[PDB]
Design an enzyme around this catalytic site. Structure first.
Site, PDB file in Angstrom:
ATOM      1  N   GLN A  61      10.422 -28.364   9.088  1.00 20.05           N
ATOM      2  CA  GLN A  61       9.021 -27.930   9.216  1.00 20.05           C
ATOM      3  C   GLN A  61       8.816 -26.722  10.126  1.00 20.05           C
ATOM      4  OE1 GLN A  61       6.131 -30.900   8.571  1.00 20.05           O
ATOM      5  NE2 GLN A  61       7.608 -32.224   9.687  1.00 20.05           N
ATOM      6  N   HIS A 142       9.750  -3.067  -0.261  1.00 20.22           N
ATOM      7  CA  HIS A 142      10.084  -1.641   0.000  1.00 20.22           C
ATOM      8  C   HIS A 142      11.504  -1.561   0.554  1.00 20.22           C
ATOM      9  CE1 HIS A 142       9.152   2.694   1.634  1.00 20.22           C
ATOM     10  NE2 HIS A 142      10.281   2.268   2.390  1.00 20.22           N
ATOM     11  N   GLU A 143      11.752  -2.476   1.489  1.00 18.74           N
ATOM     12  CA  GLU A 143      13.033  -2.574   2.172  1.00 18.74           C
ATOM     13  C   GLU A 143      14.200  -2.986   1.282  1.00 18.74           C
ATOM     14  OE1 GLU A 143      13.133  -0.714   4.772  1.00 18.74           O
ATOM     15  OE2 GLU A 143      11.195  -0.864   5.628  1.00 18.74           O
ATOM     16  N   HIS A 146      15.398  -0.228  -1.130  1.00 20.17           N
ATOM     17  CA  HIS A 146      16.335   0.745  -0.539  1.00 20.17           C
ATOM     18  C   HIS A 146      17.791   0.385  -0.799  1.00 20.17           C
ATOM     19  CE1 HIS A 146      13.973   3.796   1.594  1.00 20.17           C
ATOM     20  NE2 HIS A 146      13.319   2.819   2.323  1.00 20.17           N
ATOM     21  N   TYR A 157      19.061  10.592   1.987  1.00 23.72           N
ATOM     22  CA  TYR A 157      17.861  10.381   2.774  1.00 23.72           C
ATOM     23  C   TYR A 157      17.428  11.621   3.557  1.00 23.72           C
ATOM     24  CZ  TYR A 157      14.356   7.110   4.559  1.00 23.72           C
ATOM     25  OH  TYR A 157      13.170   6.394   4.871  1.00 23.72           O
ATOM     26  N   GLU A 166      12.033   7.337  -0.897  1.00 26.31           N
ATOM     27  CA  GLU A 166      10.844   6.653  -0.304  1.00 26.31           C
ATOM     28  C   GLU A 166       9.757   6.256  -1.310  1.00 26.31           C
ATOM     29  OE1 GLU A 166      11.860   5.316   2.753  1.00 26.31           O
ATOM     30  OE2 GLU A 166       9.715   5.483   2.523  1.00 26.31           O
ATOM     31  N   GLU A 177       4.196  -6.511  -5.347  1.00 22.05           N
ATOM     32  CA  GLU A 177       2.923  -7.012  -4.843  1.00 22.05           C
ATOM     33  C   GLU A 177       1.945  -7.453  -5.939  1.00 22.05           C
ATOM     34  OE1 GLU A 177       1.188  -5.214  -1.365  1.00 22.05           O
ATOM     35  OE2 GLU A 177      -0.799  -5.498  -2.180  1.00 22.05           O
ATOM     36  N   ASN A 183      -3.267 -10.516  -3.616  1.00 20.29           N
ATOM     37  CA  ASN A 183      -4.297  -9.460  -3.243  1.00 20.29           C
ATOM     38  C   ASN A 183      -3.838  -8.007  -3.458  1.00 20.29           C
ATOM     39  OD1 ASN A 183      -6.282 -11.064  -2.148  1.00 20.29           O
ATOM     40  ND2 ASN A 183      -6.000 -10.375  -0.063  1.00 20.29           N
ATOM     41  N   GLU A 187      -2.082   0.501  -1.970  1.00 24.29           N
ATOM     42  CA  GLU A 187      -1.816   0.854  -0.569  1.00 24.29           C
ATOM     43  C   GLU A 187      -0.498   0.235  -0.094  1.00 24.29           C
ATOM     44  OE1 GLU A 187      -4.775   2.914  -0.778  1.00 24.29           O
ATOM     45  OE2 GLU A 187      -4.752   2.404   1.329  1.00 24.29           O
ATOM     46  N   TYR A 193      -0.661  -3.862   9.063  1.00 28.49           N
ATOM     47  CA  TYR A 193      -0.975  -2.686   9.902  1.00 28.49           C
ATOM     48  C   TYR A 193      -2.335  -2.824  10.582  1.00 28.49           C
ATOM     49  CZ  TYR A 193      -1.499   2.331  10.853  1.00 28.49           C
ATOM     50  OH  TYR A 193      -1.646   3.600  11.493  1.00 28.49           O
ATOM     51  N   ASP A 226      10.944  14.034  10.378  1.00 31.01           N
ATOM     52  CA  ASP A 226      10.943  12.909   9.417  1.00 31.01           C
ATOM     53  C   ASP A 226      11.950  13.119   8.300  1.00 31.01           C
ATOM     54  OD1 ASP A 226      10.260  10.588   8.071  1.00 31.01           O
ATOM     55  OD2 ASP A 226       8.706  11.619   6.914  1.00 31.01           O
ATOM     56  N   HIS A 231       8.775  10.571   4.453  1.00 25.67           N
ATOM     57  CA  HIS A 231       7.616   9.681   4.397  1.00 25.67           C
ATOM     58  C   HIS A 231       6.322  10.434   4.157  1.00 25.67           C
ATOM     59  CE1 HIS A 231      10.615   7.204   6.733  1.00 25.67           C
ATOM     60  NE2 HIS A 231      10.051   6.209   5.876  1.00 25.67           N
TER      61      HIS A 231
END
Ligand SMILES: CC(C)C[C@H](N[C@@H](CCc1ccccc1)C(=O)O)C(=O)N[C@@H](Cc1c[nH]c2ccccc12)C(=O)O
Ligand SMILES: [Ca+2]
Ligand SMILES: [Ca+2]
Ligand SMILES: [Ca+2]
Ligand SMILES: [Ca+2]
Ligand SMILES: [Zn+2]
Length: 316
Positions: A61, A142-143, A146, A157, A166, A177, A183, A187, A193, A226, A231
């Site tokens: 649990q 997203h991760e 990669h 990269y 990216e 998603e 939901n 975005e 965030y 970057d 990004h």
């Protein structure tokens, strides 16, 4: 670990209750045996030494607030495996059912998450810019994407090839998603965030400019930060992919939408057959038109919506 596969219940970062696949062997581990060669979630204990310990619990649990990021990373990594398997027929990120590893509670107030070449890693956030990063399903996928890119196109990269790297992680993060029906939107990072401010997010695919990112090729970032704006410039590709899906008129170019299932499967094909480590934006345009051709015919509408979207963003 060797033990008996069983099912636990926990609460995630956002306070939602879910069942997770665990393995019993004196303790209960965050080891899910039902997917490929397994999905393993580790405790990094606020250190930076990876992976950390494989997550062990006494009673199956997972309702402690320390538990939350582990429940979500372990769960969402499951959904992501399931998306690639069921939608694209891909067994793990290597296509061979490689084991999927995550660590949570990495460092102190660490406002980021990353794929290190072998593993995923999630900060807890400082409590105000971010909350624990695995609480976002688009962030998790997203991760994991990669890792998919690494095993396939190998996109380096930096500069254009990095920004394509990216955009691909944003695009499939959003499709996962929508897959989970959690939901879903266009975005990135919204669930995790700035817990203080409602309605915002890290990046927008539907209007990158909302946060200052380019939505047209002439507005490309050309400096140095970057890794040559990986990004930043991914805004241009994110907008193209949004247009192919949903449609719209952007800088006076009109695009008919062909929806999100076809999007993903034009992109997945481009990714796995046509893209190479040094591909630039205008090679991505050729790859995507070539994919759509393969799939739907040279004089399809699908081919035509790909051409319009890339014209609309100044890519060619
Ligand atoms: C999907 C997103 C929630 C997290 C995502 N993480 C990055 C990995 C970043 C990384 C790279 C090297 C060493 C450490 C971290 C990625 O996968 O490309 C990202 O877009 N990171 C951005 C945006 C971001 C994360 N933390 C930030 C702090 C402040 C403002 C923006 C950010 C960044 O690294 O730039
Ligand atoms: Ca417990
Ligand atoms: Ca959402
Ligand atoms: Ca989102
Ligand atoms: Ca917010
Ligand atoms: Zn990324």
């Amino acid at each position: 670990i060797t033990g008996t596969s069983t099912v636990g219940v926990g609460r995630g970062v956002l306070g939602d209750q879910k069942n997770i696949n665990t393995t019993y062997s004196t303790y209960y581990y965050l080891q899910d045996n039902t997917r490929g060669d397994g999905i393993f979630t580790y405790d990094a204990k606020y250190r930076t030494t990876l992976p950390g310990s494989l997550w062990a619990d006494a009673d199956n649990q997972f309702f402690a607030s320390y538990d939350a990021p582990a429940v979500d990373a372990h769960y969402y990594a499951g959904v992501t495996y399931d998306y690639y398997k069921n939608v694209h027929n891909r067994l793990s990120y290597d296509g061979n059912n490689a084991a999927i590893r995550s660590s949570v509670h990495y460092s102190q107030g660490y406002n980021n998450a990353f794929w290190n070449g072998s593993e995923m890693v999630y900060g807890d956030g400082d409590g105000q810019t971010f909350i624990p990063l695995s609480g976002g399903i688009d962030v998790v996928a997203h991760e994991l994407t990669h890792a998919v890119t690494d095993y396939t196109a190998g996109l380096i990269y930096q500069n254009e090839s990095g920004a394509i790297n990216e955009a691909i992680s944003d695009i499939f993060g959003t499709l996962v998603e929508f897959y989970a029906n959690k939901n879903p939107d266009w975005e990135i990072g919204e669930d995790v965030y700035t817990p203080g401010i409602s309605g915002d997010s890290l990046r927008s695919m539907s209007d990158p400019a909302k946060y200052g990112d380019p939505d047209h090729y002439s507005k490309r970032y050309t400096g140095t930060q970057d890794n040559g704006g990986v990004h930043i410039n991914s805004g241009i590709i994110n907008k193209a992919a949004y247009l192919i899906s949903q449609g719209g008129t952007h800088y006076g170019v009109s695009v008919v939408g062909i929806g999100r299932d076809k999007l993903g499967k034009i992109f997945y094909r481009a990714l796995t057959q046509y893209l190479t480590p040094t591909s630039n934006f205008s090679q991505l345009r050729a790859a995507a038109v070539q994919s759509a051709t393969d799939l739907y015919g040279s004089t399809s509408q699908e081919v035509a919506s790909v051409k319009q979207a890339f014209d609309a963003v100044g890519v060619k």
